[PDB]
């Protein structure tokens, strides 16, 4: 699941620095705002997302950020 989010984020930031993807975390289709900076900082934003749903997105955001820098 958390790996499947990194896949969709990676496919979104290929032709644009800002995109929106749909993620099915757990029993809900969550709209997800994906953003990247020139320096390479990724922010994943979920709106109207339950704390739980927000934390899984923070875990995915940290995992992909380490892959970006490395």
């Amino acid at each position, epitope marked *: 699941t958390e790996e499947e989010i990194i896949e969709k984020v990676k496919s979104a930031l290929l032709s*644009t*620095n800002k995109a929106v993807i749909s993620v099915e975390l757990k029993g809900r289709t969550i709209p997800l705002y994906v953003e990247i900076t*020139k320096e390479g900082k990724l922010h994943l934003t979920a709106e109207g997302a339950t704390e739980e749903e927000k934390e899984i997105i923070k875990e995915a955001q940290k995992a992909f950020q380490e892959e970006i820098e490395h």
Partner: antibody
Amino acid sequence: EVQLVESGGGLVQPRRSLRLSCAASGFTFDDYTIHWVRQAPGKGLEWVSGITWNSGYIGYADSVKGRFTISRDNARNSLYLQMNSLRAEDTALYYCVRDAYVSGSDYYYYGLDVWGRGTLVTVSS
Amino acid sequence: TGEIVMTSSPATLSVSPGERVTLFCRASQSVISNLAWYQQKSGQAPRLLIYGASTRATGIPSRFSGSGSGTEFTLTISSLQSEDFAVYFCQQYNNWPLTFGGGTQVNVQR
């Protein structure tokens, strides 16, 4: 003179193979992602495949996955497309297209800004 | 699947020189402003007109303008001219696979 020039198209039988080439000119080839986009005769456009500048990401349309292989040689400023298990539906004009979005640049552009004239691929017995 | 389907409309359009032309593109999911517009004349490679949802490419005449954000987009030709008779494609670039619309063919009214 920013341009992309395709080569390698021709008549091919079904189930066989063909290798398309694309030569870049007038721009830094190692900074852009490059795409293959095909157009069936009298029909719309269809994205086939794309490669990032360092070949770090490679994408294929579901209609050509497993059969097509894209690769690039930034030393020769050349793009290649290896087509295997060719079918009649693969008959189209194949464009070599440069993506305008360069990650890490100061001023961003978007879309498909540089197209080649295309090379025609006919799959028929 | 994650693939975003582009829907062009109308399939064909007939207009006279001087008229105002509006072409529509609809996305199956949200694409924000990651939408481009292309012009293709007969037997020629597509030419990029507008890359941001409203940002005109360099060299593109001012009569072309684009609009929309999300899943509903429009391309406007304020005063169509003779060289504007072609096929117009929309293309999203929110996420791969890159996808195009079917296209709208603008024809000469008679």
